[PDB]
Amino acid sequence: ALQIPFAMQMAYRFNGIGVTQNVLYENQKLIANQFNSAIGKIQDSLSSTA
């Protein structure tokens, strides 16, 4: 394992889909909130949906 900051790993993940990585940094708070909210929806989904 080689350490790398998570906001910098996600920029590599964005280049890996052909989205130029400035699109992450210009939207980092939004992308973090969409991710945090989406993990929220997993808990609500699993907690209710047997």
Partner: protein
Amino acid sequence: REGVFVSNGTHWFVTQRNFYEPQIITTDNTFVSGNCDVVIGIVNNTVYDPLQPELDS
């Protein structure tokens, strides 16, 4: 454009992700987008513009 920024402690370089090869930061190695205010954890350094010493002759 490709690779990642790194510092040896005193100087800033750009390097391909999978093998340490420190290169001077230039307008060829890098692309602009927007301005300083939006990016979390941006830093200040010169970016060398290779054309300017040619036109300085």
